[PDB]
Amino acid sequence: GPHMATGQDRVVALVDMDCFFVQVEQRQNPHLRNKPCAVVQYKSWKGGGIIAVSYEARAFGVTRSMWADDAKKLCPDLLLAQVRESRGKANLTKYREASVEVMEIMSRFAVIERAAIDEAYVDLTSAVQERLQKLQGQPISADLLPSTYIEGLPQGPTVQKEGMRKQGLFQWLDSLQIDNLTSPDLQLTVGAVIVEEMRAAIERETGFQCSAGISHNKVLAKLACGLNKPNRQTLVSHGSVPQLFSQMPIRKIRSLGGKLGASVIEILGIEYMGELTQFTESQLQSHFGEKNGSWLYAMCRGIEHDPVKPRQLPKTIGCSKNFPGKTALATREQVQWWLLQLAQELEERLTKDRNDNDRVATQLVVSIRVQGDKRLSSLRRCCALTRYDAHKMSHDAFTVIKNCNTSGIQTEWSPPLTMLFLCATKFSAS
DNA sequence: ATTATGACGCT
DNA sequence: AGCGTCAT
Ligand SMILES: Nc1ncnc2c1ncn2[C@H]1C[C@H](O)[C@@H](COP(=O)(O)OP(=O)(O)OP(=O)(O)O)O1
Ligand SMILES: [Ca+2]
Ligand SMILES: [K+]
């Protein structure tokens, strides 16, 4: 009891831009605003591949990884915006730059960890302490939480969505004011007030809307964020965990959506995260390893200690192109021309990164896929990255991969290559 | 022919 | 070092 950790020491948020690439395109082109629309890359094969979908289009069943020609069958009036193509490949610069806009705003409020192009974790513990000092015992008004859901509420003894949201918020605040909750619950509530302010600043200063989760750790904040999308935020308290986890499929928890989660389900014969509480820590470690077992034991009780890392910039800068089916690269000249295209994009991005961020990459990683191999990468080799020069990088990448060509004819490449990837890594200050 | 990324773990 | 997993 009095010595059992409860993982309530931090306030962590996860902010996730709504349908991010779509919003970037809708800001630029007002004709796309408030419409079913999607972002596509390429166009020739089946209309292009959809990579982002507005909520209006999701209502018709349009999803990521769908061909645009197929999405048009579900939604004939679907509008499309195409990712820019440069040097023969998709170029994501517009979205990376829009991401920097949002990350820089978030950084004014607290330390952030860039989790993805449109996702960041926020460690709000210190900001919450400061705001509590400012509040000076003053109650928190529902007006400060206009887009917040309290997971699990309302409960106990309105048929519209917003009505339910307000009922749950009122129950939560009523119990905080009466002193029937805990200090961690108050800390989370102040965290949610700050996240409302952060999200309002993002929308004011960029036009972009987002969703957010507020809880005591990264996994719960991530889970919380997805509960009420789009343009809403969700507070998951420690006390909400048993009910929330009691019907939560294991695959919904970050890191458990793949083979490990499937093995947890199969080996233990369970379905929901809460069912993990019935195993000892040693049992879980025996099946899933020391690290995973301790993580699962704490996580199923709502406890996780992974820190929000102070990192706003990506740690690698990479450029990749697939060459599917009949387009697989089958001559040496083809391989060299495409390595050059990739290296030219990489050089441009690296030179900009060095000027903006006072750092230089020192390692070049070259990865390829051969036709027939089921794995995304068939081979990875590294070499020194000593000059930001596209011809040198493309020649070096060729040097490190040239021995993979089985073909007895030097001019021919076999087996054909279905993917090329260049990645700059190992940054040092400059 | 579900593409272009990006972080992190294992040995 | 090179490979594998998980995720957006
Ligand atoms: N598999 C992918 N391939 C290519 N681009 C992707 C992929 N997944 C995500 N992206 C890009 C497009 C998305 O706009 C952006 C953020 O991804 P993600 O958060 O999963 O979805 P989303 O922002 O489009 O919608 P949501 O509102 O559900 O968050 O990253
Ligand atoms: Ca998103
Ligand atoms: K995201």
Are A128 and A190 a contacting pair, CB within 8 Å? yes
Ligand 1 binding pocket mutation candidate from A17, A39, A56 (most atoms within 8 A of CB) = A17
Which chain C positions have some atom within 7 A of a protein CB? Answer: 1-8
Sheet holding A148-150, edge to edge: A111-116, A119-123, A12-17, A210-215, A233-235, A148-150
Among residues A145, A280, A161, A237, the alpha carbon closest in space to that of A200 is found at: A145
Q: Which residues face A106 on adjacent strands?
A: none
List the residue whose alpha carbon is closest to atom 2 of ligand 1. Answer: A51
Rounded to 5°, the CA angle A218-A223-A224 comes to 95
Q: How far is the CA of A211 from the centre of ligand 3 (A)?
A: 10
Q: According to the entry, how was the structure determined?
A: X-ray
Residue whose tokens read 């507005």:
A54
Question: How many other C-beta atoms can be found within 10 angstroms of the C-beta atom of residue A388?
Answer: 18
Rounded to 5°, the CA angle A34-A23-A48 comes to 95
Q: How far is the CA of A296 from the centre of ligand 1 (A)?
A: 27
Helix ranges, A55-207 (H): 55-58, 68-74, 93-109, 125-135, 161-177, 183-206
CA A226 to ligand 1: nearest atom: 28
With a CB cutoff of 8 Å and minimum separation 6, the contacts of A387 are none
Largest CA distance in chain A: 82
Question: Hey, is A362 helix, strand or coil?
Answer: strand
Q: Identify the burial level of A295 via C-beta atoms within 10 angstroms of its C-beta, where 0-12 means exposed, 13-18 middle and 19 or more buried.
A: buried
Question: Hey, is A425 helix, strand or coil?
Answer: strand
**Buried-state track A45-59, b at ≥16 Cβ within 10 A, e below 16:** eebbbbbbbbebbbe
Q: How far, rounded to the nearest angstrom, does the alpha carbon of residue A250 sit from its chain's CA centroid? A: 19
Are A430 and A360 a contacting pair, CB within 8 Å? yes
> Domain residues of chain A, as ranges?
1-18+89-249, 19-88, 250-307, 308-430
Cα–Cα distances (Å) from A114 to A99, A172, A310, A390, in that order, read 10, 31, 8, 28
Q: Is A16 annotated as a binding residue?
A: yes
Residue whose tokens read 């018709």:
A60
DSSP state of A64: T
Question: How many other C-beta atoms can be found within 10 angstroms of the C-beta atom of residue A108?
Answer: 10
Question: How many other C-beta atoms can be found within 10 angstroms of the C-beta atom of residue A166?
Answer: 18
Residue whose tokens read 């517009």:
A94
Ligand nearest to the CA of A52: 1
